[PDB]
mmCIF file of C-alpha atoms (C1' of nucleotides) in Angstrom:
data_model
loop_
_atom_site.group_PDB
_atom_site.id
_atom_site.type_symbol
_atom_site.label_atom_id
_atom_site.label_comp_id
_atom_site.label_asym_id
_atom_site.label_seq_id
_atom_site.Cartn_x
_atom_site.Cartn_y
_atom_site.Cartn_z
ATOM 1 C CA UNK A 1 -33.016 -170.676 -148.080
ATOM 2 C CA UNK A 2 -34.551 -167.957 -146.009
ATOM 3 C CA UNK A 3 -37.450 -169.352 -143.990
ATOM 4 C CA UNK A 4 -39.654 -166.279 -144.793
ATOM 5 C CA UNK A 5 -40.403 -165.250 -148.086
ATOM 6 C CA UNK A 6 -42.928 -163.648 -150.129
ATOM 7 C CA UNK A 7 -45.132 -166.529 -151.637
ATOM 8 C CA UNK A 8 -43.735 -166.126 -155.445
ATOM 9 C CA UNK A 9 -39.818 -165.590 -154.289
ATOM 10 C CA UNK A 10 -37.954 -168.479 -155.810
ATOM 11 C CA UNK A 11 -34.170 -169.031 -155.907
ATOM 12 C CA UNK A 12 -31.720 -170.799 -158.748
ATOM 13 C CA UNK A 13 -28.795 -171.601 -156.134
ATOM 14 C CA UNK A 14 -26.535 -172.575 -159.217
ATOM 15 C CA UNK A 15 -26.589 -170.825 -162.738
ATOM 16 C CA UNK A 16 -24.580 -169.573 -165.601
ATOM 17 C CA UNK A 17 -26.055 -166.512 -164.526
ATOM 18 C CA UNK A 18 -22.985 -164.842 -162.326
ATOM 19 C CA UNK A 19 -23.930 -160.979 -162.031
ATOM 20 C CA UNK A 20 -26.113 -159.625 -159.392
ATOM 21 C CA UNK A 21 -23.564 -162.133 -156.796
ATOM 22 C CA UNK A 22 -23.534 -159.459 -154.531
ATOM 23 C CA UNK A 23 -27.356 -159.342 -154.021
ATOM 24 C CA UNK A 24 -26.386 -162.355 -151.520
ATOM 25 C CA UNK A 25 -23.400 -162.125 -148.773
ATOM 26 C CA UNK A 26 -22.564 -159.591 -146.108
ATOM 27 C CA UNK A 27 -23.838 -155.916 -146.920
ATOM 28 C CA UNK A 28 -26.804 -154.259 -146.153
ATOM 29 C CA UNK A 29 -27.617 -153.921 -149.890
ATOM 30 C CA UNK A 30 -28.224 -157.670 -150.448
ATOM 31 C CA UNK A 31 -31.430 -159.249 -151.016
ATOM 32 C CA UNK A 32 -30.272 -162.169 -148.985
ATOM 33 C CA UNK A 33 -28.330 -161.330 -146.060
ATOM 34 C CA UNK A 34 -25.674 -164.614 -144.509
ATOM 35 C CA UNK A 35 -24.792 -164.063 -140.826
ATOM 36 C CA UNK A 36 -23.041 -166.954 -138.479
ATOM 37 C CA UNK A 37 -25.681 -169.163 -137.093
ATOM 38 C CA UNK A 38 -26.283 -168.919 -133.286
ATOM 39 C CA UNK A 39 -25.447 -172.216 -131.432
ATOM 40 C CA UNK A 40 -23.343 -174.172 -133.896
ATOM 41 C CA UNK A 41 -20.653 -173.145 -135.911
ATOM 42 C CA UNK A 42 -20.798 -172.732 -139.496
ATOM 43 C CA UNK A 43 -24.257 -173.469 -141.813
ATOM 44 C CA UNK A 44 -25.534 -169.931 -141.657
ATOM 45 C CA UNK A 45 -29.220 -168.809 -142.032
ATOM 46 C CA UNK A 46 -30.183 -165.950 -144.503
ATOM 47 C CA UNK A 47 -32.810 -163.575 -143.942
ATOM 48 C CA UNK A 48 -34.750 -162.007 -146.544
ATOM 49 C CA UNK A 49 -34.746 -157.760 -147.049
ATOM 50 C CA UNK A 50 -37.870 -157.085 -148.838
ATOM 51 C CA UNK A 51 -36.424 -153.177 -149.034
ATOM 52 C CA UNK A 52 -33.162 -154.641 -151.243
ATOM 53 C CA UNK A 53 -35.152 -157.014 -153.508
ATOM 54 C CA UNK A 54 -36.921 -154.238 -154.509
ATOM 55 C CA UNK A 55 -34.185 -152.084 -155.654
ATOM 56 C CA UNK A 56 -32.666 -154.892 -158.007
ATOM 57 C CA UNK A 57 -31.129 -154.545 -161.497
ATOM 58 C CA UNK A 58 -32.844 -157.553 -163.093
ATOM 59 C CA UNK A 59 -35.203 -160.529 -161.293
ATOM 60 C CA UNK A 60 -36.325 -163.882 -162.895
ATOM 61 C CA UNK A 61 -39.489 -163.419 -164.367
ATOM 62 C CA UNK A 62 -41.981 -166.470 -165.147
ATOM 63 C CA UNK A 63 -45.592 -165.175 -166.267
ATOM 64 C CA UNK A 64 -48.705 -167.553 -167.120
ATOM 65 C CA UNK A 65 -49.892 -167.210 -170.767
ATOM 66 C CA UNK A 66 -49.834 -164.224 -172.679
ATOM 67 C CA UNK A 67 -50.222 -162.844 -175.973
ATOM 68 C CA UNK A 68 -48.309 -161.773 -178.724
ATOM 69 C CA UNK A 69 -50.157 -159.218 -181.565
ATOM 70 C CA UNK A 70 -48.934 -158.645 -184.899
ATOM 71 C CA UNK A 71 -50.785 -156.565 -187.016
ATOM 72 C CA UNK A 72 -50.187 -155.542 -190.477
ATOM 73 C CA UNK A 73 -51.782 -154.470 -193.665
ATOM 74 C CA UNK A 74 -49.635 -156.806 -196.069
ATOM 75 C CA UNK A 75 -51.785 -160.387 -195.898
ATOM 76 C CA UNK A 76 -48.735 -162.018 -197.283
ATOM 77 C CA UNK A 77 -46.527 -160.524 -194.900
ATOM 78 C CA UNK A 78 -48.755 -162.016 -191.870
ATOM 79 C CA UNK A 79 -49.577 -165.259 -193.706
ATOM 80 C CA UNK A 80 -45.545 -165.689 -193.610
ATOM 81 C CA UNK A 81 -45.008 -164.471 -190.498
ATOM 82 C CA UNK A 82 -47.576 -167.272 -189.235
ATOM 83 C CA UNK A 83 -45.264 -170.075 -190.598
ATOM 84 C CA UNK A 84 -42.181 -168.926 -189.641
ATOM 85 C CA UNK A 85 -42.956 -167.343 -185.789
ATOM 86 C CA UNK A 86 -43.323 -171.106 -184.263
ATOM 87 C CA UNK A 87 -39.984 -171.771 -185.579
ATOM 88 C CA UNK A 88 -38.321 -168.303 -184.598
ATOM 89 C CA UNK A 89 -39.224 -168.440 -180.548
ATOM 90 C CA UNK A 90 -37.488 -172.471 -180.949
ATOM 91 C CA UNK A 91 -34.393 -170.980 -182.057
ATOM 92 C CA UNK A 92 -34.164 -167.740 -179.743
ATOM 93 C CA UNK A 93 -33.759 -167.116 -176.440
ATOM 94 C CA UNK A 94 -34.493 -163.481 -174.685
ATOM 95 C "C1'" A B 1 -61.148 -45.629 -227.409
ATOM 96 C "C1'" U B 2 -59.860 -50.055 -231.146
ATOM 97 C "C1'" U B 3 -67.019 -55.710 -232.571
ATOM 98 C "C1'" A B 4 -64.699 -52.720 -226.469
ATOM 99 C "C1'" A B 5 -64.323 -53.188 -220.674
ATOM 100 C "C1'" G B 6 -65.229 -56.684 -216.068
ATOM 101 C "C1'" A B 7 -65.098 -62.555 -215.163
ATOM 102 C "C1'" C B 8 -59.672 -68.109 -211.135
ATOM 103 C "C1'" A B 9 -62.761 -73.988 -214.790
ATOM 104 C "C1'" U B 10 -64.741 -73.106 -210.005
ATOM 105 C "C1'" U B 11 -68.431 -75.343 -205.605
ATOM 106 C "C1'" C B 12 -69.645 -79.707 -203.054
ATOM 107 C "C1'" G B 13 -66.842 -85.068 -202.766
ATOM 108 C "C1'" U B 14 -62.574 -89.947 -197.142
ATOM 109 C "C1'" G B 15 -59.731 -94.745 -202.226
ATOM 110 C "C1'" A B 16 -63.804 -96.293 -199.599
ATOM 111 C "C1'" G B 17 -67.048 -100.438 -198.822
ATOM 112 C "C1'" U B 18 -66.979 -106.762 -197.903
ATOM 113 C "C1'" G B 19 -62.332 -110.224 -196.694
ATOM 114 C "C1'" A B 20 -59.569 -115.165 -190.656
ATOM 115 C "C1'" U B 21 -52.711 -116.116 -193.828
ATOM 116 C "C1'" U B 22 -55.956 -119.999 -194.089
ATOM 117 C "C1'" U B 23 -56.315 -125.249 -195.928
ATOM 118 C "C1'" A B 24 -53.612 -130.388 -196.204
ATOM 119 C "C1'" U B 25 -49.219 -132.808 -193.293
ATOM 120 C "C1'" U B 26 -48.141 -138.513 -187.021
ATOM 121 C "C1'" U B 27 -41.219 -135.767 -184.690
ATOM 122 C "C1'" C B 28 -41.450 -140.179 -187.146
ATOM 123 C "C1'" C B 29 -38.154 -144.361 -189.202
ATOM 124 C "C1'" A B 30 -33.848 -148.441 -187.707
ATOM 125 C "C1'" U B 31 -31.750 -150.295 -183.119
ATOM 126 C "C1'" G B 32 -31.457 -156.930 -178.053
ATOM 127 C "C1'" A B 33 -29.864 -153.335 -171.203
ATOM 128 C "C1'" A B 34 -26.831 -156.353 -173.256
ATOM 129 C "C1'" G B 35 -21.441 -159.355 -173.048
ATOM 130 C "C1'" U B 36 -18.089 -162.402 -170.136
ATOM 131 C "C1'" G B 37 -17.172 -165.662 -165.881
ATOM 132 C "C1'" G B 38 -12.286 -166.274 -162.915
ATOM 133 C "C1'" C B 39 -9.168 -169.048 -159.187
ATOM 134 C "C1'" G B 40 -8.614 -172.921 -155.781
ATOM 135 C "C1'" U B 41 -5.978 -178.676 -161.407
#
RNA sequence: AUUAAGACAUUCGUGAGUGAUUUAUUUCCAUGAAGUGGCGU
């Protein structure tokens, strides 16, 4: 972990999620940037490029509360849509 | 020399005056920026 971070930067070291590898290693493009440690060998440091995380294909987003509208004219369309929309966000992902 | 001779159906006169090619009409409908890990047993 890079010991200087903005205050909502979070990491998952270990995921099913394996694109975007590059945005940690070597080149001047990654987020995260491993160089040998002074001192001892081995157990590198990282340092954080504010500049790269920007320019990112996709980040991990994780938002407080929010709202979902749907609006229609049909009352039996909505009155359905109420029973079934608890059970359609269980069995989905996004 | 004969109910005869002379006599432009002609003069003046705008097819003109008033008039919105306008009123009504959603470039909209459907659609997952997603899929997958691999090798070092």
């Amino acid at each position: 972990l890079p010991t200087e971070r903005p205050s909502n930067f979070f990491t998952i070291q270990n995921s099913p999620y394996f694109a975007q590898e590059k945005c940690v290693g070597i080149n001047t493009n990654s987020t995260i940037i491993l160089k040998k440690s002074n001192s001892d060998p081995r157990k590198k440091e990282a340092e954080f490029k504010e500049k790269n995380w920007s320019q990112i294909d996709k980040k991990g987003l994780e938002w407080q509360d929010f709202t979902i509208k749907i609006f229609s004219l049909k009352g039996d369309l909505i009155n359905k849509i109420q029973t079934y929309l608890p059970a359609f966000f269980i069995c989905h992902n996004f």
